[PDB]
Structure 1
Amino acid sequence: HMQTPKETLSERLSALQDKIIDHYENDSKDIDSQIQYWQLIRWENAIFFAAREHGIQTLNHQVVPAYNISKSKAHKAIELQMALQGLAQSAYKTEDWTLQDTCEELWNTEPTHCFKKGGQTVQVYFDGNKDNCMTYVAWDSVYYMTDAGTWDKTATCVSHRGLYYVKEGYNTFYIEFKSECEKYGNTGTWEVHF
Structure 2
Amino acid sequence: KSKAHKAIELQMALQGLAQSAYKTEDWTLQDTCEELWNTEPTHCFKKGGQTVQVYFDGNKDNCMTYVAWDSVYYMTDAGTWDKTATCVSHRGLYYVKEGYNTFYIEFKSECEKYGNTGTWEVHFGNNVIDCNDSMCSTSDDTVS
With normalisation by structure 1, the TM-score equals 0.62
Provide runs of 4+ in structure 1 moved above 6 Å: none
Counterpart secondary structure, 2:108: helix
Cα distance in 2, alignment partners of residues 109 and 74 from structure 1: 17
Cα distance in 1, alignment partners of residues 91 and 116 from structure 2: 15
Unmatched 5+ stretches in structure 2: 125-144
Counterpart secondary structure, 1:163: strand
Residue 85 (structure 1) shift: 0.8
Residue 72 (structure 1) shift: 2.2
Worse-superposed segment, 166-175 or 71-80: 71-80
Establish whether residue 147 from structure 1 lines up as the match of residue 49 from structure 2.
no
Higher strand proportion (structure 1 or 2): 2
Match of 2:5 in 1: 75
Higher helix proportion (structure 1 or 2): 1
Match of 1:183 in 2: 113
Residue 73 (structure 1) shift: 2.8
Unmatched 5+ stretches in structure 1: 1-70
Match of 1:115 in 2: 45
**1:130-181 Cα shifts (integer Å, max 9, x gaps):** 1101100110000001000111100011111011100001100011000000
**1:59-81 Cα shifts (integer Å, max 9, x gaps):** xxxxxxxxxxxx32321110100
Counterpart secondary structure, 2:55: strand
Residue 84 (structure 1) shift: 0.6
Residue 97 (structure 1) shift: 1.7
Residue 119 (structure 1) shift: 0.6
With normalisation by structure 2, the TM-score equals 0.83
Cα distance in 2, alignment partners of residues 186 and 82 from structure 1: 43
**1:111-138 Cα shifts (integer Å, max 9, x gaps):** 1110000011000011111110110011
Relative contact order (alpha carbons < 8 A, sep ≥ 6): 1 or 2 greater?
A: 2
Which one has the largest radius of gyration? 1
Match of 1:168 in 2: 98
How many aligned positions are there? 124
Match of 1:42 in 2: none
Residue 186 (structure 1) shift: 2.3
C-alpha RMSD of the superposition:
0.9
